[PDB]
């Protein structure tokens, strides 16, 4: 329905699928990266019924479906379910067809190469896209925030990346890829809500908990003080209404979950927290770099939207950092969806139109070509 | 008795049609009620929490 | 006809009773409901009105 061959831009993560066209300032539509399948035997005849449901269809009919996410902490493994997600994203939402548009997809700098190769292969072989470009999420995160220099803190559902970039250059030895993410927070919250007498173990229950987290959770600037009062009084409790009419009242779990970002040991992770990884990624850089990176810690992705998160990390980084120098976190409202915006910025740059893999070079070389053409 | 019946059936069916409409009014009313409660709850709570977290300005 | 009338009259009464029972529970619903309806939005509305001003600092 577009009147120009604008690139399509999409962030296909372990959580949400964000999509729109290059040149806009927001995805046109956002939905979960879900393909659902019936877990029951049908008994009525002439009921239609799909073998599998996609995106909002998967959630709408979820009462009898098991729901799977094709992307595992940033990498695509179930490419067949992702073909369905892309087809839905492009044709039933954006009303575009990749065949008529070049397409940009994105991944973290230390994401296994298999992800970039499979995304390239499917868009060229099943969607016949005229061109492809796998972008770096860190590049897109700083484009959207307006920086050439800073730390990308992309703390979303899949993985936290923690990468320093200076004057548009990577400083890769200082990347602290961390297995701590929004996805772990959903499962951790299911376990601490079990402690309160409300057990959650199934897909429907997981989707309920993801909704509780997204609507009730925060981290707070001072954890121990927030904990002491939440654990002592109903004044810091907040209720949540479940799809079936049940009501759950949540106290310190409201922040104890999110606090795992600063205390990863809560989920058994060997980590000092996201503020230390930010700190060390800067400390491993030269001193004429550090002055600019400490003043530009930049948030992207989910969990960055929690109350107290920018202040919590800035406080800890500042405490670890030397004096005189200023430490600051950049945390714009275009949060959680800013990498998509960065994709639009990259896709539309005049300096980027020579970076595309065309569907000529692709067939001559095969999908491994992405490893040499994109970055 | 037939006329009384037709009248009694008219009343029973009138009332059944009317009660159906009233039952619908209740279903709608309760959905409206829930909207009032849910919006109220959401507003009162989004403010208690917005003000409890947004205290530093 | 007598039995149908008794059943229809009984049903005329039960259906009309259900009608006046629901008209009443509906009124008693709606009336108490409008109270919520008129105060939940007015409280939240005046809270939001006040917020525009509460935030004028």
């Amino acid at each position: 329905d577009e009147d120009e061959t604008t690139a399509l831009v999409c962030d296909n993560g372990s959580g949400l699928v964000k999509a729109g066209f290059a040149g806009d300032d927001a995805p046109r539509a956002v939905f979960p990266s879900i393909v659902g399948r019936p877990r029951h035997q049908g008994v009525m005849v002439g009921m239609g019924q799909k073998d599998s449901y996609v995106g909002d269809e998967a959630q709408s009919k979820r009462g009898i479906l098991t729901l799977k996410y094709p992307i595992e902490h940033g990498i695509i493994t179930n490419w067949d379910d992702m073909e369905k997600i892309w087809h839905h994203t492009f044709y039933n939402e954006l009303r575009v067809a990749p065949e008529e548009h070049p397409t940009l997809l994105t991944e973290a700098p230390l994401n296994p190469k298999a992800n970039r190769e499979k995304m390239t292969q499917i868009m060229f072989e099943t969607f016949n896209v005229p061109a492809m470009y796998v972008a770096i999420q860190a590049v897109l995160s700083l484009y959207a925030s307006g920086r050439t220099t800073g730390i990308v803190l992309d703390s979303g559902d899949g993985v936290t990346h923690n990468v320093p970039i200076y004057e548009g250059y990577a400083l890769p030895h200082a990347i602290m890829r961390l297995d701590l993410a929004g996805r772990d927070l959903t499962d951790y919250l299911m376990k601490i809500l079990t402690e309160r007498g409300y057990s959650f173990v199934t897909t429907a229950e997981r989707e309920i908990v993801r909704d509780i987290k997204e609507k009730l959770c925060y981290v707070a600037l001072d954890f121990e003080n927030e904990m002491a009062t939440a654990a002592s009084s109903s004044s810091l409790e907040k209720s949540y209404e479940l799809p079936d009419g049940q009501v759950i009242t949540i106290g310190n779990e409201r922040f104890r979950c999110p606090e795992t970002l600063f205390q990863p040991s809560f989920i058994g992770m060997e980590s000092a927290g996201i503020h230390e990884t930010t700190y060390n990624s800067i400390m491993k850089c030269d001193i004429d770099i550090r002055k600019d990176l400490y003043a530009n810690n930049v948030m992207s992705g989910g969990t960055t939207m929690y109350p107290g998160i920018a202040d919590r990390m800035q406080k800890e980084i500042t405490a670890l950092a030397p004096s005189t120098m200023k430490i600051k976190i950049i945390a714009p409202p275009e949060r959680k969806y800013s990498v998509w915006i960065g994709g639009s910025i990259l896709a539309s740059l005049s300096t980027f139109q020579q970076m595309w893999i065309t569907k000529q070079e692709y067939d001559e070389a095969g999908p491994s070509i992405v490893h040499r053409k994109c970055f | 008795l037939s006329d009384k019946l037709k009248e009694a059936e008219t009343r029973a069916e009138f009332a059944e049609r009317s009660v159906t409409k009233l039952e619908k009014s209740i279903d709608d009313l309760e959905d409206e009620l829930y909207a009032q409660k849910l919006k109220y709850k959401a507003i009162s709570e989004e403010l208690d929490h917005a003000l409890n977290d947004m205290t530093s300005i | 006809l007598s039995d149908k009338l008794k059943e229809a009259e009984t049903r005329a009464e039960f259906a009309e009773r259900s009608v006046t029972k629901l008209e009443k529970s509906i009124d008693d619903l709606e009336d108490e409901l409008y109270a919520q309806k008129l105060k939940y939005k007015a409280i939240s509305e005046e809270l939001d009105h006040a917020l525009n001003d509460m935030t004028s600092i």
Binding site: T324 | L47, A50, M54, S56 | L51
Partner: peptide
């Protein structure tokens, strides 16, 4: 409090920047 969410960001950023300037203005010696 949408008014606050943004005014909060504005004032925290503006005071932090003004304070950073106050501190540097003296600290530079």
């Amino acid at each position: 409090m949408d008014a606050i969410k943004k005014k909060m960001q504005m004032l925290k950023l503006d005071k932090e920047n003004a304070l950073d300037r106050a501190e540097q203005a003296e600290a530079d010696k």
